[PDB]
Design a protein around this ligand. Structure first.
Ligand code: FAD
Length: 500
């Protein structure tokens, strides 16, 4: 008896999962010949390549538990294998007599490298590998082909390409496994009946004092519930315009499906299909780029440009990226990283990010503009790394692509438009309720100076119980001065890049 293996990496779902569906149908169309091992590998190698903060570890822990729970409802289970894929797969290919291995493809360079190796090993041991592109709606390889070998570098050109592509068929959940025995323990399972059980919170979260509020629980079950809740107001869905959603409402103004889409707890193909059904029903609706479908297409757009560029997450060697002489300023980077810049709006966003792991798109604009071209003139690569640590929805392509946009390094070139860290929040939160929540030491400042506490006299600062320089920091830079200087620096950088 030989085993069929589905390998979860992203695609942490049962629904719309061709790679997992195929394994299950095969076992049921040939009962008694096959064992089924759906596995997730806790790969120590990823940690040399990315930073993972406490909140995202908890999201993953919750996700694996949910996935295990869901697979048990199909008379299977999740097997979580600790170890490096390069060492894990030779062992299990033999110990399990693996006939077929399936998985969902991914475009990240670490994935491409790791997957090539596993495919060279699988080819040697005569294991059939079947892969499916279901993390994105469109296959970036096909978008690039249709555009004659280059990724489209504007959203509009990208949309014109993908309109002519076939939308994939969205699958349901696999059928339960008919009359399948629990596979026989292997070398590892026999010395430890739990060697493959889902990690506990304690095993994955080494810094539990860094966990914030548990607001967006991991897993497909929660993803589908949140999707269904977001889709209940069909008018809100149909008429959604991303630029008009508030970054500093106390409740999120957008769907917060991004963590679920990042891990593939939610199929983007399913979400796209559900959105299209509502749009069909609601004749007055928005269009890309600002519509909700438009948002999924931004994800597709960045996945496509990123697929063509292994250096997408760095300035050097990145075909898209303007070479800009960013400066090193460790103290300013640290103040930004910890929300101690002395601009309350910026600090509120960075504290929400650290505590909760999600901030709105335009809140990400504000802080990324401040770090890079707007104020501190620090490389977007530094911002990317902090976001990588703190965001539940950390996504190699999306983080890099939007950082390049916000820093005017690629895709966006109107660097003379600079967010103000004082004025920008006021449009949608003139009372500063968001600042009061995340910078509570300012909570007694009136609306007239809560965005600009340095405009309060010392007497009033003492009265409000928050003296600048003691209880809340002084501004680390004066926006009105530095952002004018940075516009000149950017223009110089654009000139140099144009001459090369
Ligand atoms: C500096 C910076 C870094 C970012 N890093 C990430 C990241 O690491 N991971 C991430 O998922 N998004 C990232 N984004 C994009 C965007 O801000 C988030 O996708 C969005 O805030 C998710 O919130 P939401 O799910 O409520 O989005 P909604 O507005 O409800 O959109 C639905 C989905 O569309 C996609 N989407 C929406 N906006 C964008 C966008 N601008 N680019 C790409 N896809 C988009 C996401 O999958 C999102 O879940 C970043 C943006 C900026 C400016």
């Amino acid at each position: 008896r030989s085993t069929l293996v589905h390998w979860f990496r992203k695609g942490l779902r049962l629904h719309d999962n061709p790679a997992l569906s195929h394994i299950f149908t095969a076992a049921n169309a040939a009962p008694g010949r096959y064992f089924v091992r759906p596995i997730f590998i806790l790969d120590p190698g990823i940690l040399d390549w990315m930073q993972v903060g406490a909140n995202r570890w908890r999201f993953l822990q919750q996700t694996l538990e949910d996935l295990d729970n869901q697979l048990r409802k199909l008379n299977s289970r999740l097997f979580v294998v600790r170890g490096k894929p390069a060492e894990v797969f030779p062992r299990i290919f033999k110990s399990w007599r693996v006939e077929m291995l399936t998985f969902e493809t991914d475009i990240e360079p670490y994935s491409v490298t790791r997957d090539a190796a596993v495919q060279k090993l699988a080819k040697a041991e005569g294991v059939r590998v079947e892969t499916h592109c279901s993390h994105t709606i469109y296959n970036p390889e096909l978008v690039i082909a249709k555009n004659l070998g280059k990724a489209p570098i504007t959203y509009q050109k990208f949309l014109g390409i993908v309109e002519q592509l076939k939308v994939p068929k969205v699958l349901g959940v696999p059928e339960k496994l008919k009359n399948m025995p629990t596979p026989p323990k292997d070398e590892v399972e026999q010395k430890d009946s739990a060697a493959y059980d889902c990690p506990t919170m304690k095993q994955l979260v080494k810094r539990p004092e860094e966990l914030g509020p548990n607001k967006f629980p991991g897993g497909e079950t929660e993803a589908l519930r949140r999707m269904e809740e977001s889709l209940k107001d069909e008018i809100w869905v149909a008429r959604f315009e991303k630029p008009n959603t508030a970054p500093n409402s106390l409740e999120p103004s957008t769907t917060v499906l991004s963590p679920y889409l990042k891990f593939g707890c939610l199929s983007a193909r399913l979400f796209n299909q559900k959105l299209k059904e509502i749009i069909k029903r609601q004749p007055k609706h928005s269009q890309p780029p600002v519509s909700l479908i438009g948002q999924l297409m931004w994800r597709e757009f960045y996945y496509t440009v990123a697929a063509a560029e292994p250096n997408f997450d760095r300035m050097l060697g990145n075909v898209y990226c303007m070479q800009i002489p960013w400066q090193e300023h460790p103290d300013h980077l640290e103040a930004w990283t910890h929300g101690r810049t002395g601009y309350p709006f910026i600090d509120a966003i960075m504290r929400q990010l650290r505590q909760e792991g999600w901030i709105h798109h335009l809140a990400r604009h504000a802080v990324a503009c401040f770090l890079t071209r707007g104020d501190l003139w620090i490389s977007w690569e530094e911002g990317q790394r902090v976001f990588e640590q703190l965001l539940l929805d950390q996504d190699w392509a999306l983080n890099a692509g939007n950082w390049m946009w916000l820093s005017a390094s690629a895709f966006f070139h109107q660097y003379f438009r600079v967010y103000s860290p004082v004025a920008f929040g006021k449009k949608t939160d003139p009372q500063g309720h968001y600042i009061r929540k995340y910078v509570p030491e300012l909570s007694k400042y009136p609306a007239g100076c809560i965005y600009e506490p340095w405009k309060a006299s010392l007497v009033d600062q003492r009265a409000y119980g928050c003296v600048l320089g003691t209880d809340y920091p002084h501004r680390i830079v004066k926006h009105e001065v530095v952002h004018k200087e940075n516009i000149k620096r950017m223009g110089a950088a654009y000139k140099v890049n144009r001459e090369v």
